[PDB]
PDB file of C-alpha atoms (C1' of nucleotides) and ligand atoms in Angstrom:
ATOM      1  CA  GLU V   1     136.362  26.106  50.092  1.00  0.00           C
ATOM      2  CA  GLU V   2     136.474  22.675  48.431  1.00  0.00           C
ATOM      3  CA  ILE V   3     139.087  20.055  49.229  1.00  0.00           C
ATOM      4  CA  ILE V   4     141.194  19.288  46.175  1.00  0.00           C
ATOM      5  CA  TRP V   5     141.209  15.518  46.575  1.00  0.00           C
ATOM      6  CA  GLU V   6     143.757  15.014  43.760  1.00  0.00           C
ATOM      7  CA  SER V   7     146.630  16.237  45.940  1.00  0.00           C
ATOM      8  CA  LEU V   8     149.452  15.244  48.294  1.00  0.00           C
ATOM      9  CA  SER V   9     149.122  16.032  51.988  1.00  0.00           C
ATOM     10  CA  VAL V  10     152.201  16.257  54.208  1.00  0.00           C
ATOM     11  CA  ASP V  11     152.751  16.605  57.951  1.00  0.00           C
ATOM     12  CA  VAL V  12     155.392  16.385  60.696  1.00  0.00           C
ATOM     13  CA  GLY V  13     155.260  14.242  63.802  1.00  0.00           C
ATOM     14  CA  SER V  14     157.482  14.441  66.828  1.00  0.00           C
ATOM     15  CA  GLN V  15     158.386  13.232  70.291  1.00  0.00           C
ATOM     16  CA  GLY V  16     158.887  16.566  72.001  1.00  0.00           C
ATOM     17  CA  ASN V  17     159.341  19.967  70.357  1.00  0.00           C
ATOM     18  CA  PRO V  18     162.211  20.337  69.968  1.00  0.00           C
ATOM     19  CA  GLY V  19     162.618  16.589  69.912  1.00  0.00           C
ATOM     20  CA  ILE V  20     162.651  13.567  67.626  1.00  0.00           C
ATOM     21  CA  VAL V  21     161.128  14.603  64.276  1.00  0.00           C
ATOM     22  CA  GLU V  22     159.675  12.605  61.387  1.00  0.00           C
ATOM     23  CA  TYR V  23     157.359  13.449  58.511  1.00  0.00           C
ATOM     24  CA  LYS V  24     155.277  11.777  55.865  1.00  0.00           C
ATOM     25  CA  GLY V  25     153.299  12.414  52.733  1.00  0.00           C
ATOM     26  CA  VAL V  26     150.026  10.750  51.839  1.00  0.00           C
ATOM     27  CA  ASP V  27     147.617  10.695  48.941  1.00  0.00           C
ATOM     28  CA  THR V  28     144.798  12.976  50.077  1.00  0.00           C
ATOM     29  CA  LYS V  29     142.171  10.824  48.359  1.00  0.00           C
ATOM     30  CA  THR V  30     143.256   7.315  49.376  1.00  0.00           C
ATOM     31  CA  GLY V  31     145.407   7.895  52.468  1.00  0.00           C
ATOM     32  CA  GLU V  32     148.170   5.765  50.974  1.00  0.00           C
ATOM     33  CA  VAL V  33     151.533   6.643  52.487  1.00  0.00           C
ATOM     34  CA  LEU V  34     153.764   7.794  49.647  1.00  0.00           C
ATOM     35  CA  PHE V  35     156.872   8.626  51.684  1.00  0.00           C
ATOM     36  CA  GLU V  36     157.899   8.652  55.327  1.00  0.00           C
ATOM     37  CA  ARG V  37     161.205   9.959  56.660  1.00  0.00           C
ATOM     38  CA  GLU V  38     163.160   7.971  59.245  1.00  0.00           C
ATOM     39  CA  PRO V  39     163.100   9.843  62.577  1.00  0.00           C
ATOM     40  CA  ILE V  40     165.690  12.594  63.004  1.00  0.00           C
ATOM     41  CA  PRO V  41     167.074  12.729  66.569  1.00  0.00           C
ATOM     42  CA  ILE V  42     166.502  16.455  67.251  1.00  0.00           C
ATOM     43  CA  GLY V  43     164.559  19.050  65.317  1.00  0.00           C
ATOM     44  CA  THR V  44     161.563  21.337  65.553  1.00  0.00           C
ATOM     45  CA  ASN V  45     158.013  20.985  64.361  1.00  0.00           C
ATOM     46  CA  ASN V  46     158.551  23.712  61.804  1.00  0.00           C
ATOM     47  CA  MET V  47     161.799  22.310  60.431  1.00  0.00           C
ATOM     48  CA  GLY V  48     159.989  19.024  59.913  1.00  0.00           C
ATOM     49  CA  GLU V  49     156.991  20.724  58.285  1.00  0.00           C
ATOM     50  CA  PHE V  50     159.389  22.524  55.936  1.00  0.00           C
ATOM     51  CA  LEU V  51     161.273  19.342  55.019  1.00  0.00           C
ATOM     52  CA  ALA V  52     157.960  17.573  54.408  1.00  0.00           C
ATOM     53  CA  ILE V  53     156.856  20.161  51.838  1.00  0.00           C
ATOM     54  CA  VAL V  54     160.223  20.197  50.045  1.00  0.00           C
ATOM     55  CA  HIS V  55     160.284  16.404  49.990  1.00  0.00           C
ATOM     56  CA  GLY V  56     156.790  16.498  48.479  1.00  0.00           C
ATOM     57  CA  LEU V  57     157.943  18.955  45.818  1.00  0.00           C
ATOM     58  CA  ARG V  58     160.839  16.668  44.917  1.00  0.00           C
ATOM     59  CA  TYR V  59     158.624  13.563  44.941  1.00  0.00           C
ATOM     60  CA  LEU V  60     156.060  15.134  42.612  1.00  0.00           C
ATOM     61  CA  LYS V  61     158.669  16.677  40.307  1.00  0.00           C
ATOM     62  CA  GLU V  62     160.396  13.321  39.777  1.00  0.00           C
ATOM     63  CA  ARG V  63     157.034  11.765  38.862  1.00  0.00           C
ATOM     64  CA  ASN V  64     155.928  14.543  36.497  1.00  0.00           C
ATOM     65  CA  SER V  65     152.926  15.189  38.735  1.00  0.00           C
ATOM     66  CA  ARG V  66     151.147  18.547  38.837  1.00  0.00           C
ATOM     67  CA  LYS V  67     149.125  17.723  42.006  1.00  0.00           C
ATOM     68  CA  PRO V  68     149.089  20.429  44.698  1.00  0.00           C
ATOM     69  CA  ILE V  69     150.565  19.878  48.154  1.00  0.00           C
ATOM     70  CA  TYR V  70     148.541  20.537  51.303  1.00  0.00           C
ATOM     71  CA  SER V  71     150.286  21.576  54.521  1.00  0.00           C
ATOM     72  CA  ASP V  72     148.720  22.711  57.784  1.00  0.00           C
ATOM     73  CA  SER V  73     151.794  24.857  58.620  1.00  0.00           C
ATOM     74  CA  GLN V  74     151.569  28.586  57.827  1.00  0.00           C
ATOM     75  CA  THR V  75     155.215  28.821  58.863  1.00  0.00           C
ATOM     76  CA  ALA V  76     156.504  26.078  56.561  1.00  0.00           C
ATOM     77  CA  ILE V  77     154.502  27.366  53.593  1.00  0.00           C
ATOM     78  CA  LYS V  78     156.084  30.793  54.050  1.00  0.00           C
ATOM     79  CA  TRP V  79     159.584  29.334  54.480  1.00  0.00           C
ATOM     80  CA  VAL V  80     159.248  27.331  51.257  1.00  0.00           C
ATOM     81  CA  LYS V  81     158.020  30.366  49.325  1.00  0.00           C
ATOM     82  CA  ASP V  82     160.918  32.415  50.743  1.00  0.00           C
ATOM     83  CA  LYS V  83     163.375  29.535  50.080  1.00  0.00           C
ATOM     84  CA  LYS V  84     164.624  30.160  53.626  1.00  0.00           C
ATOM     85  CA  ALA V  85     163.796  28.287  56.856  1.00  0.00           C
ATOM     86  CA  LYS V  86     164.088  30.888  59.630  1.00  0.00           C
ATOM     87  CA  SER V  87     164.357  28.416  62.498  1.00  0.00           C
ATOM     88  CA  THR V  88     165.527  29.483  65.961  1.00  0.00           C
ATOM     89  CA  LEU V  89     166.942  26.043  66.741  1.00  0.00           C
ATOM     90  CA  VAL V  90     170.547  26.232  67.914  1.00  0.00           C
ATOM     91  CA  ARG V  91     173.005  24.949  65.311  1.00  0.00           C
ATOM     92  CA  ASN V  92     175.465  22.750  67.186  1.00  0.00           C
ATOM     93  CA  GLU V  93     176.765  19.181  67.293  1.00  0.00           C
ATOM     94  CA  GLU V  94     173.438  17.778  68.514  1.00  0.00           C
ATOM     95  CA  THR V  95     171.376  19.520  65.800  1.00  0.00           C
ATOM     96  CA  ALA V  96     173.826  18.921  62.948  1.00  0.00           C
ATOM     97  CA  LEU V  97     171.630  16.455  61.057  1.00  0.00           C
ATOM     98  CA  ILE V  98     168.407  18.480  60.929  1.00  0.00           C
ATOM     99  CA  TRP V  99     170.337  21.590  59.918  1.00  0.00           C
ATOM    100  CA  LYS V 100     172.119  19.667  57.163  1.00  0.00           C
ATOM    101  CA  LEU V 101     168.751  18.540  55.811  1.00  0.00           C
ATOM    102  CA  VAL V 102     167.284  22.036  56.024  1.00  0.00           C
ATOM    103  CA  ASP V 103     170.311  23.479  54.246  1.00  0.00           C
ATOM    104  CA  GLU V 104     170.021  20.839  51.531  1.00  0.00           C
ATOM    105  CA  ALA V 105     166.286  21.463  51.093  1.00  0.00           C
ATOM    106  CA  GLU V 106     166.951  25.194  50.674  1.00  0.00           C
ATOM    107  CA  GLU V 107     169.660  24.342  48.159  1.00  0.00           C
ATOM    108  CA  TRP V 108     167.190  22.199  46.180  1.00  0.00           C
ATOM    109  CA  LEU V 109     164.701  25.081  46.103  1.00  0.00           C
ATOM    110  CA  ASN V 110     167.466  27.395  44.842  1.00  0.00           C
ATOM    111  CA  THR V 111     168.438  25.004  42.007  1.00  0.00           C
ATOM    112  CA  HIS V 112     165.077  23.769  40.644  1.00  0.00           C
ATOM    113  CA  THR V 113     161.765  25.051  39.401  1.00  0.00           C
ATOM    114  CA  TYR V 114     158.382  23.661  40.285  1.00  0.00           C
ATOM    115  CA  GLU V 115     154.820  24.530  39.470  1.00  0.00           C
ATOM    116  CA  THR V 116     153.238  22.616  42.401  1.00  0.00           C
ATOM    117  CA  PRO V 117     150.702  24.798  44.192  1.00  0.00           C
ATOM    118  CA  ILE V 118     151.367  24.788  47.931  1.00  0.00           C
ATOM    119  CA  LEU V 119     148.005  25.070  49.674  1.00  0.00           C
ATOM    120  CA  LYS V 120     146.936  25.608  53.263  1.00  0.00           C
ATOM    121  CA  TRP V 121     144.922  22.708  54.622  1.00  0.00           C
ATOM    122  CA  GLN V 122     141.901  24.285  56.331  1.00  0.00           C
ATOM    123  CA  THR V 123     141.927  22.392  59.617  1.00  0.00           C
ATOM    124  CA  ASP V 124     139.218  24.553  61.180  1.00  0.00           C
ATOM    125  CA  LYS V 125     136.781  23.614  58.398  1.00  0.00           C
ATOM    126  CA  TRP V 126     137.906  20.135  57.333  1.00  0.00           C
ATOM    127  CA  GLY V 127     139.462  18.498  60.398  1.00  0.00           C
ATOM    128  CA  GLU V 128     142.971  17.134  60.734  1.00  0.00           C
ATOM    129  CA  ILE V 129     145.138  16.858  57.637  1.00  0.00           C
ATOM    130  CA  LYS V 130     145.252  13.282  56.348  1.00  0.00           C
ATOM    131  CA  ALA V 131     149.037  12.980  56.987  1.00  0.00           C
ATOM    132  CA  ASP V 132     148.606  13.774  60.692  1.00  0.00           C
ATOM    133  CA  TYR V 133     150.217  11.423  63.217  1.00  0.00           C
ATOM    134  CA  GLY V 134     147.205  11.308  65.582  1.00  0.00           C
ATOM    135  CA  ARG V 135     149.302  12.195  68.645  1.00  0.00           C
ATOM    136  CA  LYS V 136     147.283  15.216  69.811  1.00  0.00           C
TER     137      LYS V 136
ATOM    138  C1'   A A   1     146.012  36.825  67.097  1.00  0.00           C
ATOM    139  C1'   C A   2     146.940  33.213  64.168  1.00  0.00           C
ATOM    140  C1'   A A   3     149.138  28.720  62.189  1.00  0.00           C
ATOM    141  C1'   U A   4     151.339  24.501  64.333  1.00  0.00           C
TER     142        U A   4
ATOM    143  C1'  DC L   1     151.341  22.453  81.053  1.00  0.00           C
ATOM    144  C1'  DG L   2     155.677  22.592  77.719  1.00  0.00           C
ATOM    145  C1'  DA L   3     157.351  24.011  72.719  1.00  0.00           C
ATOM    146  C1'  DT L   4     157.931  26.407  67.411  1.00  0.00           C
ATOM    147  C1'  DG L   5     156.785  30.031  64.286  1.00  0.00           C
ATOM    148  C1'  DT L   6     154.446  34.706  61.234  1.00  0.00           C
TER     149       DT L   6
HETATM  150  K1    K N   1     146.842  20.314  63.518  1.00  0.00           K
HETATM  151  K1    K N   2     149.328  14.437  65.656  1.00  0.00           K
HETATM  152  K1    K N   3     153.759  32.776  70.451  1.00  0.00           K
HETATM  153 MG1   MG N   4     151.180  19.847  60.656  1.00  0.00          MG
HETATM  154 MG1   MG N   5     149.682  16.934  62.545  1.00  0.00          MG
END
RNA sequence: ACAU
DNA sequence: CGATGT
């Protein structure tokens, strides 16, 4: 329908999938970068999309903001609503960091409330989400 | 089949 | 072409 311009948009970027993962959140209206995570050596697209939403929830909660969050990831939206990231990535020594972050994000969801609406960015109708990394 |  | 996910 209509873009809600008063919102936060988040997205993952990577070098390979699985591969090096990063994510960021931007003001949908202005494009200003509000947060960007230092690259994580190995993760998946969906783990990064999930972390990006949870980071957005935490960022907005700390600022008393009721803005919605846009994500282009059906998977990550579902994982956040379930409070469970059902990733297939092997959990071993190489993937320890991403799994630690995912575990901690789940723990945050299980210990806090939020009213932030989590909305699907409608890429087919509106083009690329404003937090996209432009690598495709 | 659809979302990344 | 490879990959992650519902
Ligand atoms: K996309
Ligand atoms: K991109
Ligand atoms: K598939
Ligand atoms: Mg995305
Ligand atoms: Mg993108």
